Design a protein around this ligand. Structure first.
Ligand SMILES: [Cl-]
Ligand SMILES: [Cl-]
Ligand SMILES: [Cl-]
Lengths: 132, 132
């Protein structure tokens, strides 16, 4: 019941390589390598979430990690928002190209939104909680 | 060419009333009244954006204003993200109920995402830039 999931699972490496070229990563960033690892991990979590194999609470560990890294990198936390949205936009593009029917499209858009909304909300919340 | 706009334009006072019941806004907030006015303004801007009457750049000044107010309120900036998402979710619910076909649904989802992503990104960006 999820071609999008199958597509992303098979194309994980390609998806991340393409995403890396579109994100904002500063050469000075001490965690620039972790940015990629976090992305790889969260793409995997996204697939599992669409398959209803994890709950959203399970990404909160990663969100706290990202937040702490961003604090230490001394970068505007909105860059993380931008970089996350690059991935979301591409996933939406892939969903469109797979050409699901309306019912399926609607179900997947809800899950996509729930995942990314939580990731962004929790990471920014955590950034401010930890920086305090 | 957009029933969603007409619905929101007509039901605007009610939409805001319902939204106010679901958001994080404390009576101690020095800008509690402005939060509602900002909401009213941005709902109008959203409608104009759907109608292709404004560009996304035109909400950046409002984002900077919100960010300044949030700094002064001494709240976690993620509360703004939560509050914005409450509106987006309800808009998505209204879109679903209005029963568009897939093509129209996709076109509006893209505009909804673009508007809200820009609002969240620019406000959080400005919050960090203004706070130092
Ligand atoms: Cl769901
Ligand atoms: Cl109320
Ligand atoms: Cl201002």
């Amino acid at each position: 019941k999820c071609l999008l999931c199958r597509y992303l699972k098979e194309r994980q490496e390609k998806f991340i390589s393409d995403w890396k070229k579109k994100v904002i990563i500063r050469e000075r960033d001490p965690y620039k390598e972790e940015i990629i690892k976090n992305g790889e991990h969260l793409l995997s979590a996204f697939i599992m979430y669409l398959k209803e194999e994890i709950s959203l609470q399970e990404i909160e560990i990663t969100s706290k990690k990202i937040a702490r890294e961003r604090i230490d990198a001394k970068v505007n936390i909105a860059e993380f928002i931008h970089n996350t949205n690059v991935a979301k936009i591409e996933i939406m593009n892939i969903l469109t190209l797979l050409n699901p029917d309306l019912q399926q499209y609607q179900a997947l858009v809800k899950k996509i939104n729930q995942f990314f909304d939580h990731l962004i909300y929790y990471t920014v919340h955590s950034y401010y909680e930890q920086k305090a």
